[PDB]
Amino acid sequence: SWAQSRDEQNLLQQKRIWESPLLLAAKDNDVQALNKLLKYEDCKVHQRGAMGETALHIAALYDNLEAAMVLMEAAPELVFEPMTSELYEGQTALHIAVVNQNMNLVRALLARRASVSARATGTAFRRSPCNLIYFGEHPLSFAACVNSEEIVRLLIEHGADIRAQDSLGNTVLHILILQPNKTFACQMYNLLLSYDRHGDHLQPLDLVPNHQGLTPFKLAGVEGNTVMFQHLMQKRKHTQWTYGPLTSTLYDLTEIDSSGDEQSLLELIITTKKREARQILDQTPVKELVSLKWKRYGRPYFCMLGAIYLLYIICFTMCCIYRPLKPRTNNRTSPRDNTLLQQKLLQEAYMTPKDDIRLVGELVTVIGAIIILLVEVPPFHVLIITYAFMVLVTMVMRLISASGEVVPMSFALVLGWCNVMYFAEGFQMLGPFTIMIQKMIFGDLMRFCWLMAVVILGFASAFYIIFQTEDPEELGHFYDYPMALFSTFELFLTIIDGPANYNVDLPFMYSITYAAFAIIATLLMLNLLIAMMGDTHWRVAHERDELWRAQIVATTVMLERKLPRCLWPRSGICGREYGLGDRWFLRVEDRQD
Amino acid sequence: SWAQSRDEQNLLQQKRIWESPLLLAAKDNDVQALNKLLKYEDCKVHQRGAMGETALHIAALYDNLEAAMVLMEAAPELVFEPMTSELYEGQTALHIAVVNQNMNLVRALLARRASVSARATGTAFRRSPCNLIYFGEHPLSFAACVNSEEIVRLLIEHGADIRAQDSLGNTVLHILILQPNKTFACQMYNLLLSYDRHGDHLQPLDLVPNHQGLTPFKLAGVEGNTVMFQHLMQKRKHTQWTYGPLTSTLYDLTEIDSSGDEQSLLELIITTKKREARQILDQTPVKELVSLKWKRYGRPYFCMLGAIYLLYIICFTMCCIYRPLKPRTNNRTSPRDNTLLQQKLLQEAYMTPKDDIRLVGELVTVIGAIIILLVEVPPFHVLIITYAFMVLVTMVMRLISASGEVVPMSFALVLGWCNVMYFAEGFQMLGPFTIMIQKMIFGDLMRFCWLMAVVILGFASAFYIIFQTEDPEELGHFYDYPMALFSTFELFLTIIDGPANYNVDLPFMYSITYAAFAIIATLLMLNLLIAMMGDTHWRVAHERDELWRAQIVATTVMLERKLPRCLWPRSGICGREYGLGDRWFLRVEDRQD
């Protein structure tokens, strides 16, 4: 109940105005009532509200100009006076006059030498999903986001600095990208760059990092602000000749390359949670990059890496289906014909020099498993690891030479083979599988496997009741409750033949109960076809080539985290030879159409 | 044949006008013919039509002004004269002049001191699906629904009361909500509140109940009048400060809370039959309420209640799969190898102190069943009950210690387990199942299970004919007609393997007949996939979050019917401390966008 403490405090504000004569006459524009109340008697100007209001704030907050100008004579010092605590901290009355788009009071308050450097450090202004707005701190930034142009430039004409930062370190630029309305505040980004006249030696305000090291350009990438992203690109491209319908531009490629350890852009696109930042890749200087990082140097270094994994698993199965295997010379089948097994898995046999090949082939798998883990000492990284983690269990299980060694070899074989499906979409254009399964291995399957697990726990338990009476030498589906669940599971997916004997009479609860399992099984498994008809299929032809863009990048990003240079030159033409400088470019031709 | 008695009587009206000289000359505007017919001879003015017409009504009804003004001299008293019986009762001629939007006769009739308090109590004006209109009774209300403004205020200027009621007790306000055209009559609700000048001590006309206790506000909720519902909300919200793009309103929450035993709104939304009243929940002061009734105090009191049911059924299965069970020491298998069973279910054994745990565990189930029924001494309430009703059969079956005790234990196990699917959509967001099954367990399944039952009753009966000849020791699918239906039922849903022997020759009608069952089974079960492709799927992505709004309310409504206070405070901020009064509010911030 955190949010209730806000709302109880906000009605408490409305209680204080409603009962005090100074604040209530300030609420309405009763100038004549504010005459007799103020100049005649002694009223303290320090009347603090429920959240530390002043009389001057309430005249500003309920957009009351004529009351506030009368309050100027009585209050020479409440213009400087901040607001008190825990939601509004340091919010001076200059801010409130700005937020209501104008009052012509900013002209009046700055005539009263108002401070333009006060920081509203309250909780209600910090970035959070609890507040419905994020305007930053400094009163220049409040005039920025409301899209009031002349109110901005009036503040510059009284000494408002353009480079102050909030607690998160954001500039006045960074707040303009984070606005909920994009193009209506896009013109401010051009306007505030025109006041960059005092060129500082550090950076000319367009390269300022926050406390997590983000330029205003890269923040437009991460927060999915597409319309602003195209506009910030415009100052970096450098156009060469125009030739009829041809145009040979030259994009900059400095803050978007994987050059330094700033992780500059392409890593920061995929690592976010926000899904609409994958829309950024449709823009033209990025789309040309990731394709040319793929067709050249990207794809054949992957497919060569893919075949070695395929020869890895083949070399594992060969040293898997050949397993030591004496005939069972030890203890005979002591339970009555219900304990059949005949191999018992040899102890320390390595003779018969066919096993010399296996002992080589055993090491080829195990060494590659350590090679997997040494890459991962600091959706598919989970089962790259748990493949090789199970293989280390095997060599531990074999060198201690214990008994239950199949349960490593099982999980080291399924997780090994399904892992090669990750290399499928790398091999060819295939309309990406192995991720489209991961869109619905979480979204609908984990919701539907509730619905199968409930019914299948009933009827399996119900069949064990009605075949509790029977001789299990006929209809051995149900000799015990541990297999009665597994037996019914083959019928709900319709695999096993459904129990019937036709020579021995089955009990009369079965025929009714089994029908009420049959008709449900051809409903819920039939209704499952609709949940992946509308939800998963929804409009995926629109997002197929984007899902086949985001997956290609994440392959390229992971491959440059895990591969040294001198065999991977970064894409684009180097500078410094053509006299353009240190920044490396690339060029794109197009037709005007 | 009730409706035919109306229509035969209405042509009988047209017969009477067509044959009488007074009425037929009244029908057309033949003033010159009405001169010689009336002033010269003696004509009775009491000529009653087939439904008791007067001459003055027919001049009004066939929109004939000039005839009616000539009729004023001959008829000083027919203005007061009502219409006779069974469809039109007391419908004075003032009403008919109003219904045709005007005649300038209302000015003429009220010059003849016409009564404005006569009640048209006929069958044709009472609310019913038989009549195509519902205008109420009093002639003010007829001027209301036709959207004739000055005709309304002319009636107030001659003494028309604003608070008379019909037989259902509806006001002149309540009829305006029930209109088929909504926004075209919405302005009348503002206009008639302006004539509330005589402020009565009882209620100021906006709080008047009908005979079933409905305010005009709650009737706009129940009858799905969405556009009117937003407009009646406007006088109850109480706006606090505005702050740039922020707006902190404060909705009233008195007639929509579950406060009194008026069942005020949220119970009355879900209990109706009318489906378009679930559209009301999309409006903003209700949508904020039901979410905050859910996330706070609603969901974790449900999930805690959900796990105790899950531990209930687990504690039932444990005292179910352990059942008394002697070996069959009584009478041997007297039929020849067709009567196999070996347990016979012990009589009065409660020794072997493992059964002390079961005898505790038996009571834990049975006491909870009485707890279920004690809640229900005054779609899922049906099988909350019939679960526990079967469990009481078990303890009756065990204490009398009869034989057939499995058929209680079966139905007490399936109905117990599938019941927990009702707790599924309470547990997480899951795109509601267990109700989407109930949209098509009635709508299409009960229509399609006709089509399977007809074919499956043919071929099952047909196979028993062609295997009447055969030795049932091979192909024991069909040894008798009671199992021949059940055997074919496993093939039409394709579960059992389909009968074949390959060593004994099967009769030559089978191979043809069985194919004509196979190809139909892969058609009707295939065509069933289309009936739940278009009908059930239809546009459910639009109505998913509404079906996941109506189901959440019905959980919240049921939970407050069945849980005492001192652990459930009702939502919203209390009044009376902030000086707002007794009405409890809640506040909502939003952005203007």
Tokens standing for B256?
């929509």
Among A376, A319, A367, A424, CA closest to A561: A376
Q: Specify the resolution in Å.
A: 4.2
Cα separations (Å) of B462 from B389, B455, B492, B493, B591?
40, 10, 14, 18, 71
Round to whole Å and give the CA distance between B181 and B451.
43
- Cβ proximity of B416 and B387 under 8 Å: yes
- Cβ proximity of A320 and A413 under 8 Å: yes
The partner residues of B583 in beta bridges, in order of sequence, read none
Q: How far is CA B38 from the centre of its chain?
A: 57
Round to whole Å and give the CA distance between A385 and A372.
7
Round to whole Å and give the CA distance between B277 and B272.
8
Can you tell me which residue has the tokens 């009064």? B581
Tokens standing for B303?
């999930």
Residues of B in contact with A58 (CB under 8 A): none
Rounded to 5°, the CA angle B195-B201-B202 comes to 95
Give break positions in chain A: residue before each, C–N beyond 2.5 Å: 378
Q: How far is CA A589 from the centre of its chain?
A: 34
Tokens standing for B279?
């559209």
Among A121, A71, A62, A60, CA closest to A94: A60
> Is A378 an interface residue toward B (CB < 8 Å)?
no
Q: How far is CA B160 from the centre of its chain?
A: 37
| Dihedral of alpha carbons B61, B63, B69, B74, sign | negative
For residue B341, give the nearest of A11, A469, A509 by CB distance: A469
The partner residues of A246 in beta bridges, in order of sequence, read A243, A591
Surface-to-core class of residue B54, CB atoms within 10 Å of its CB (0-12 exposed, 13-18 middle, 19+ buried): buried
CA trace torsion A303, A304, A309, A314 (10° rounding): 100
- Cβ proximity of A419 and A387 under 8 Å: yes
Instruction: Give SS3 for A587.
Output: strand
For chain B, what is the largest distance between any 2 Cα atoms, rounded to a whole number of angstroms?
115
Round to whole Å and give the CA distance between B132 and B135.
10
- Cβ proximity of A436 and A538 under 8 Å: no
For residue A447, give the nearest of B430, B476, B580 by CB distance: B430
Round to whole Å and give the CA distance between B338 and B358.
34
Laid out side by side, the sheet with B246-251 consists of B242-243, B246-251, B586-591
Laid out side by side, the sheet with A242-243 consists of A242-243, A246-251, A586-591
- Cβ proximity of B227 and B185 under 8 Å: no
Whether A132 and B537 lie within 8 Å, measured CB to CB: no
A-B C-beta contacts closer than 8 Å: 177
Whether B338 and A526 lie within 8 Å, measured CB to CB: no
The DSSP output letter for A248 is: E
Compute how many other C-beta atoms are within 10 angstroms of the C-beta atom of residue B42. 5
- Cβ proximity of A407 and A523 under 8 Å: no
Instruction: Give SS3 for A242.
Output: strand
Instruction: Give SS3 for A323.
Output: coil
Question: Which helix (H) or strand (E) segment is A16 a member of?
Answer: helix A3-19
Question: Which helix (H) or strand (E) segment is A363 a member of?
Answer: helix A354-375
Whether B414 and A132 lie within 8 Å, measured CB to CB: no
Among B394, B410, B327, CA closest to A510: B410
Among A455, A512, A508, A516, CA closest to A485: A455
Whether A146 and B244 lie within 8 Å, measured CB to CB: yes
Interface test with A, best of B330, B413, B590 (most A CBs within 10 A): B413
- Cβ proximity of B177 and B220 under 8 Å: yes
Among A203, A198, A233, A202, CA closest to A217: A233
| Dihedral of alpha carbons B167, B169, B171, B177, sign | negative
Cα separations (Å) of B279 from A151, B252, B276, B504?
44, 20, 6, 66
Residues of B in contact with A132 (CB under 8 A): 246, 589-591
From the CA of A366, how many Å to the nearest CA of chain B?
43
Interacting residues of B328 by C-beta distance below 8 A, sequence separation 6+: B341, B342, B343, B344
DSSP, residue by residue, A21-64: HHHHHHHTT-HHHHHIIIIIS---S----TT---HHHHHHHTT-
> Is B497 an interface residue toward A (CB < 8 Å)?
yes
- Cβ proximity of A206 and A256 under 8 Å: no
- Cβ proximity of A535 and B540 under 8 Å: no
> Is A102 an interface residue toward B (CB < 8 Å)?
no
From the CA of B473, how many Å to the nearest CA of chain A?
7
* A592 torsion bin: left (phi>0), alpha (psi -120 to 50), beta (else): beta
Query: A511 to chain B: nearest residue by CA?
Result: B486
DSSP, residue by residue, B238-307: ----EETTEEEEEE--SSSSS-STT-TTHHHHHTSS-GGGGGGGGSHHHHHHHHHHHHTTTHHHHHHHHH
Backbone phi, then psi, for A396, in 5-degree steps? Answer: -65, -40
Backbone phi, then psi, for A482, in 5-degree steps? Answer: -65, -30
Round to whole Å and give the CA distance between A328 and A341.
8
The DSSP output letter for A570 is: P
Round to whole Å and give the CA distance between A161 and A170.
14
Compute how many other C-beta atoms are within 10 angstroms of the C-beta atom of residue B176. 26
- Cβ proximity of B208 and B171 under 8 Å: yes
- Cβ proximity of B431 and B548 under 8 Å: yes
Can you tell me which residue has the tokens 């019939």? B386
From the CA of A577, how many Å to the nearest CA of chain B?
52
CA gyration radius, chain B: 36
Residues of A in contact with B436 (CB under 8 A): 527
Backbone phi, then psi, for B138, in 5-degree steps? Answer: -80, 145
Among B7, B571, B479, B593, CA closest to B247: B593
Residues 35-94 on A with a CB inside 8 Å of B are 61-63
Round to whole Å and give the CA distance between A184 and A142.
15
Cα separations (Å) of B356 from A47, A528, B323?
74, 44, 13
Whether B483 and A527 lie within 8 Å, measured CB to CB: no
Residues of B in contact with A469 (CB under 8 A): 341-343, 406
Surface-to-core class of residue A356, CB atoms within 10 Å of its CB (0-12 exposed, 13-18 middle, 19+ buried): exposed
| Dihedral of alpha carbons B329, B335, B341, B345, sign | negative
Round to whole Å and give the CA distance between B406 and A318.
53
The response to whether B480 counts as a known ligand-binding position is: no
- Cβ proximity of B13 and B50 under 8 Å: yes
Instruction: Give SS3 for A255.
Output: coil
Could you tell me whether strands B242-243 and B246-251 are parallel, antiparallel, or unpaired per DSSP bridges? Answer: antiparallel
Backbone phi, then psi, for B219, in 5-degree steps? Answer: -70, -35
Method underlying the structure: cryo-EM
CA trace torsion B175, B178, B180, B186 (10° rounding): 70
Residues of A in contact with B296 (CB under 8 A): 1
Cα separations (Å) of B197 from A131, B152, B189, B192, B194?
44, 16, 15, 10, 7
- Cβ proximity of A550 and A278 under 8 Å: yes
Among A32, A5, A268, A294, CA closest to A124: A5
Tokens standing for B90?
């007391």
Backbone phi, then psi, for A263, in 5-degree steps? Answer: 60, 35
Interface test with B, best of A16, A135, A527 (most B CBs within 10 A): A527
Round to whole Å and give the CA distance between B188 and B532.
45
Among A163, A276, A164, CA closest to A227: A276
For residue B496, give the nearest of A466, A500, A505 by CB distance: A500
Round to whole Å and give the CA distance between A162 and A205.
8
> Is B525 an interface residue toward A (CB < 8 Å)?
yes
Round to whole Å and give the CA distance between A511 and A505.
11
Whether B476 and A522 lie within 8 Å, measured CB to CB: no
Question: Which helix (H) or strand (E) segment is B589 a member of?
Answer: strand B586-591
Tokens standing for B218?
């709650």
From the CA of B161, how many Å to the nearest CA of chain A?
39
Interacting residues of B522 by C-beta distance below 8 A, sequence separation 6+: none
Three-class DSSP labels, B81-101: CCCCCCCCCCCCHHHHHHHCC
Instruction: Give SS3 for B5.
Output: helix
* A260 torsion bin: left (phi>0), alpha (psi -120 to 50), beta (else): beta
Round to whole Å and give the CA distance between B51 and B281.
46
CA trace torsion A316, A318, A321, A326 (10° rounding): -110
The partner residues of B250 in beta bridges, in order of sequence, read B587
Among A220, A228, A222, A285, CA closest to A253: A285
